[PDB]
């Protein structure tokens, strides 16, 4: 069993920066992928970015690839989402997600992830 | 969508998932056991391992650590550090409550074996914090496998009770992030267990929720759990007859309605039939 | 026709098939080893068990029998009689040659464990006839599992050599119906071995042809062997890159063209059926 | 590995009886099915009758069901085929076959069997 706890959301001005964090606890020994998803009002939940937990590979959606960055803390079991040059379109609930079952690569399908956080709200105002 | 399957193998050729022992019977729990909270042999139907459950039997009911003559400081079986305050115990750590353990300790690079006797009840037994009492095991690095069990040292005079799990925590703090309990969700249903004979000074039967080979099969197949319960037949390979219908639930356990199931032969095979409702009414095994 | 597959699991999470030990590396045999005749870990690609190979790790490298203080009369692990002159040994019997065995013996219905020390060279070691010397184990029924190994008592001074199998027969009669030898097929190919660290007073590495979880997988799937060889990729789960091409043969072993430096966290994936003489690209190149 | 050795073929008059025998040796612990097949010149190897090695169930092809009988010796590891009321159509090479891989029931496809005998010739004359 794995527990995910997000923090770091809030209100931010267009063009500003914000960093989300997700504390990963429990059976972390065989977590293989950590990722961020987001769901905007009236839209479906979408993949933002993911990384091989213990590897190097990362992958980000096209609409955020040159602005967002995922990473893992070198000390604690925390994954970060660095969001730069934010736009009002980025307003959503951002969810932390974990996959422990064996897989090749970084999957983008929400149904392939095993653990989900409660979500943190990010509002980009103009 | 990959279809859900179970191994095409008879139960009598498979292994317990709480100790490396052949399956010898199918059984149900006594009337006083309604739920269980085993930490090994825990796998969802789409292949997610929980608790301390490993993929492979070569990790089941083993320990690894460094004794300083007073405590053993535990690591994962491969030597990877075990972090405290995260889980019940390292992957594969024995989950047999209600007994004293006798673990066969060996070393890479040294001769001989040592019997390590474990009372799991006292405050020095705290695998959740990475540490358990040495009880005379001299300093060194060891790997150990559960070898036999005996009645628990405390409470004095109690019997072996393998429906229990050990106390992974202590009076310092409770263990966190254990695999949750499983209970039979349907009408008249009871949990089904795969039993193995356990060496020791009694007629010991170790129950588990799934054979180890089912676990490695599910963890590999990762078939989407598209329904609420998996209807199964237990099939006799001699005649092809259906010996009883069972339900497998997504948390990774089986139920039946007893007539009974304990008297079923062990040479059969579980075959998936279809996805059914959580409340599909099973007919009694036999009747 | 049921398609051929291999488990979707990383090698480092699997087990050796000659002893209940984690896999820790990939390896090839030394120059002095041409063929191997392991009796455990032997399974065809359509799932047929040979030798003493069981379906499950819970039977691997175990013995069962009744000692009379002089010999142990062997049975199958569940107590089923083992008849002489039929096979090498009962199902799951240890097949590590080139060493002395130390087996942990326990009993159903009795306390304690006893270390059983086995020289496999003498004329009293005859599992093919259903019995092996007791070497001090008192009368009673035991189940035992291989615990650690040491250099063989005979010939004196020889080293541990886990490429060998024990002498199941005697000078009176050879053991029969052994799993046959496996040889390197040629074309620069070498056999691939899955290695495990084995306890004892040395740096002992135990080789086997197939992880035990592959065996129970093939024994369950029973996919028709439609071609002469199964081309495989060893895939890195991080990048998805193909770390090397391999061939699995119907008799149940893998080869590559040079492996020892490969990472152990990869997964073998079936690609297609190819010819017996299909030329592999060297691992890496 | 399992070894099979047939014996008992020969020439028989139409309407007579004959019993073939098959010696099963080697890894018999997990042989699950024993069966008899037959091959006529220019024809494919066809299932005659089979039995669960350790069970009771037996099964025979329609063309022999009321005349042929398969059985296992109570003492030795020998499978028998009792052929009664033989007809010229029954002339063939009869093969003993063993299956060790797990299976429910008695299979009839030649390709599902694991071990084969060398064959015994049966000639039915009028
Ligand atoms: Na405790
Ligand atoms: Na011998």
Author numbering:
A (entry chain D), D (entry chain C): 1 to 126
B (entry chain A): 228 to 486, 491 to 518
C (entry chain B): 228 to 485, 492 to 518
From the paper:
In this study, we analyzed three new norovirus-specific Nanobodies that interacted with the prototype human norovirus (i.e., genogroup I genotype 1 [GI.1]). We showed that the Nanobodies bound on the side (Nano-7 and Nano-62) and top (Nano-94) of the capsid-protruding (P) domain using X-ray crystallography. Norovirus interaction with cofactor histo-blood group antigens (HBGAs) is important for infection (e.g., GI.1, GII.4, GII.10, and GII.17), although certain genotypes poorly bind HBGAs (e.g., GII.1).
Similar to Nano-7, we found that Nano-62 bound on the side of the P domain and in the grove between two P domain monomers. However, compared to Nano-7, fewer direct hydrogen bonds were observed, and most (7 of 10) were contributed with P1 subdomain residues. Overall, the P domain interacted with Nano-62 with 10 residues from P1 subdomain and only 3 residues from P2. Interestingly, Nano-62 was also orientated in a way that one site of the Nanobody clashed with the S domain and neighboring P domains. Overall, these results suggested that the GI.1 hinge region between the P and S domains might have intrinsic flexibility to allow Nano-7 and Nano-62 to bind to intact particles. The exothermic binding of Nano-62 was characterized by a large enthalpy change coupled with favorable entropy of the binding reaction. Nano-62 did not influence the particle structure or inhibit HBGA binding; in contrast, Nano-26 was shown to induce particle disassembly upon binding to GII.
